[PDB]
């Protein structure tokens, strides 16, 4: 349970939204450099 809580917290804290979406088919958009 402690591991699950830590995993959830770490997973939900590292959401940086990937503000380099090509700016600002195979991938169908070209957005996998460390995504998916």
């Amino acid at each position: 349970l402690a591991d699950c809580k830590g995993q959830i917290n770490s997973q939900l804290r590292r959401l940086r939204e990937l503000r380099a979406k090509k700016e600002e088919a195979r991938g169908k958009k070209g957005t996998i450099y460390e995504e998916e």
Partner: protein
Amino acid sequence: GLDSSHVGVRPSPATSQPTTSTGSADLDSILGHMGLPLGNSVLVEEQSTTEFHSILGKLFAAQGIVHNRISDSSADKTRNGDTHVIVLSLNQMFAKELPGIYKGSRKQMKKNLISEEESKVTVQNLNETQRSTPSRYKDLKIAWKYKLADEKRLGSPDRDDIQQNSEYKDYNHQFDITTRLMPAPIASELTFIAPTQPVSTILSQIEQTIKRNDKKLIRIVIPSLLHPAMYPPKMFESSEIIGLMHGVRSLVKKYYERVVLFASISIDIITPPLLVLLRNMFDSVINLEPFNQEMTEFLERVYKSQPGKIQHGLVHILKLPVFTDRGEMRVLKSEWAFKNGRKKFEIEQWGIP
């Protein structure tokens, strides 16, 4: 001259004479002496617009700074490692950009199997405890028996003791990308020379710079020489450069115990006449042939699924220290592949993939 027991008074498997290490294990091994005997000069070369040459031309100075920044008590004595570093270039901005001594974990030694996030800790955005970025074998130390195409005993068993035998191996320090050898030095370690000023001034200035030290090592490194970005047309005459190089040769051959020379340029835009007229002046020539877009296809085909096995070019050797002047042919072209990724500038024996 230089008193004994300096960092690089190592013997040589041929002459048993002083041979300071270039710092890179494969650069010390391929050269053929665990470095170069004092009084000789080396010419690393890059035939294209790539700029791998800008890497080594830093550590060769920085490693010297290392021996000038550890002046504590040795096993019993206080080791001498002072090496006045000189650069014949106006770019003072280069000074504050050198890689530093490498510490911390270098490879992975997981007790259990290597696996993904759920196995040990967390999401890998916070990395796992011991080591990340799988790269099994990372070069660490120096050896006196690491020469390529030489006898056996190619390994130094990560020895952690200081002795007279530690002059040979197990002292020299590794560096990496993010490491920084801070703080920046002072005039005690780095001396910059403006190249655009006339050679008559440059020669006397470098004379006075070397002579003011009496029993200390002098290292000379030129990052880039004779390039349009920082040089005037007047210096491209066939007289000035050759005469300056002749003076440099005269002085380095005079002080065969306390000075060396290491310069490297790009020759994609150099007239062959001047190139081979100056290539005969010093006593070591090494070329580099980086890979191009037609072959990176097969590079990733054969090195597929590898995060640290990707190479970047091939190596040529055309001249080496004195023991090639005795009538032996030793030119070798495009047989060893050099890699400078994010770890461990390495040389591996293979031709085209």
